[PDB]
Amino acid sequence: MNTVPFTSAPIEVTIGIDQYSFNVKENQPFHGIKDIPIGHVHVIHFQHADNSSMRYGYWFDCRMGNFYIQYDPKDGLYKMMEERDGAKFENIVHNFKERQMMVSYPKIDEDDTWYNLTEFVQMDKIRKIVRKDENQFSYVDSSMTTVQENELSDPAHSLNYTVINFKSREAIRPGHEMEDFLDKSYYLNTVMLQGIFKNSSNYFGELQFAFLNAMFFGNYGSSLQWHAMIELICSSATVPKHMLDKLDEILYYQIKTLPEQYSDILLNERVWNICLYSSFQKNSLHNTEKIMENKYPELL
């Protein structure tokens, strides 16, 4: 079990760790989060009590180093940092644990929610979508724009999601216009899976990471990417049987985890109605269709 210590909590803030959240009061004696499950990526995220604008946070994997949070009163945020001194860090964490100044990652044993949301998400793939190669962890916030948003303004602070565009030379073979537009199987299987992603796992990894950025930060560009990657599969007549079965499980846990009160801004009516009722895969997402009908029958 890994630990992310905090130097202090000088400003009142809601702290998230993955799907969990805790309110911390200004100067409350809070010194971090222990018992973090090894083997998954994690996100630690922040919303200041005084500005419910700029949700921000850090993707990390505790296997890749010793990370801590320290408030920066110049830049006015909680910053993730790496401690390279193994002994200093073990000693910092042991003191804070002994003084019980740390909250415990509150995983229920039966509960596979976090695994299910991050099954294909790899820290090495996050660092290629979020480029800041001097850190082993990745900063994301509410307002960061995607490379595809910038094409239609700072390249260094962008989300480098794979560009998907159904009306692009990339998506449409010359002489196969109608065929490729109405059945995107060639765009999905040759261009995206064989060409760019190399395998379904990397494709699902980006899809899951896009969803989580949409949910945790209300990152609009991420929400657009999540929907585009769903639509590309649902709009392909030819999809490997295992990809469809896995997609149904992925989306089921995403829909299950969404805050009930956020369905209006994070779910795209057209895409979901298409996927579930119109598309080639209308009959292929049983679990996702059942949770969407019972939990958001309005949207449809």
């Binding site: 009306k167 692009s168 030379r169 449409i172 010359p174 216009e177 109608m178 537009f181």
Partner: protein, 237 residues
């Protein structure tokens, strides 16, 4: 974005543009089968591609053979239209290629956009105008060349005859739409109005009769009267 009565004069500026109407591409007669079911028989169609400034009409004849063994023909018809327009642009020298193409039906937007991906500088636009280009097959000479075609064929016309010698393209387009609106509302009445005086003929190289300027005013008056009557009848007002 969309073309309407607020940006009407844009049609007659010096930026090359074409209207595309697909309403006569896929044409059927519905009939009973021996077993008492219903079936369609396709007849020859046409794409109506018109430069509203010059009157140049690119009439692509759609021969019934293009439908043989195809499914979902009303959907294919939009894509075949987009394919042939795209082939037409590529066939024109660069300085003749349109800067915009306006589709009379919004269902053509995605088909044409996808077929024109090689031409990012050509704007594909819808219109809020209710244009009567569906009545093109009420012009006897256009109907004749479509129905006689034995293979796919492109035929070039000037839908304004020699009118631009005497009137502007705004006025020529207004006369064309009035004529086509009348032919669409009551073909029989419109056609009677146009040929009632057998001393006025259609030149071999023209589509419409050789009316003097005063005769065109009388004709235009009779077309408006026809359109109004039919409207009163339609709506009992």
């Amino acid at each position: 974005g969309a073309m309407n009565s607020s940006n009407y004069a844009e049609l007659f500026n010096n930026d090359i543009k074409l209207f595309v109407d697909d309403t006569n591409v896929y044409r059927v007669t519905v009939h009973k089968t021996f077993e008492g079911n219903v079936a369609t028989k396709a007849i020859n169609g046409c794409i109506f591609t018109l430069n509203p400034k010059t009157g140049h009409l690119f009439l692509k004849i759609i021969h019934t053979s293009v439908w043989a063994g195809q499914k979902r023909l009303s959907q294919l018809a939009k894509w075949k239209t987009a394919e042939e327009v795209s082939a037409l642009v590529r066939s024109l020298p660069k300085e003749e290629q349109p800067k915009q193409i306006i589709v009379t039906r919004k269902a053509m937007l995605d088909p044409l956009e996808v077929h024109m991906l090689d031409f990012p500088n050509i704007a594909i636009r819808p219109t809020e105008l209710r244009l009567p280009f569906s009545a093109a097959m009420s012009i006897d000479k256009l109907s004749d060349v479509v129905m006689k075609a034995t293979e796919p064929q492109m035929v070039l016309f000037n839908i304004y005859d020699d009118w631009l010698d005497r009137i502007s393209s705004y006025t020529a387009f207004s006369r064309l739409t009035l004529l086509l609106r009348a032919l669409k509302t009551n073909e029989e009445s419109a056609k009677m109005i146009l040929l009632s005086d057998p001393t006025i003929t259609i030149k071999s190289y023209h589509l419409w009769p050789s009316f003097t300027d005063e005769q065109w005013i009388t004709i235009e008056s009779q077309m408006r009267d026809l359109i109004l009557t039919e409207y009163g009848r339609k709506y009992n007002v």
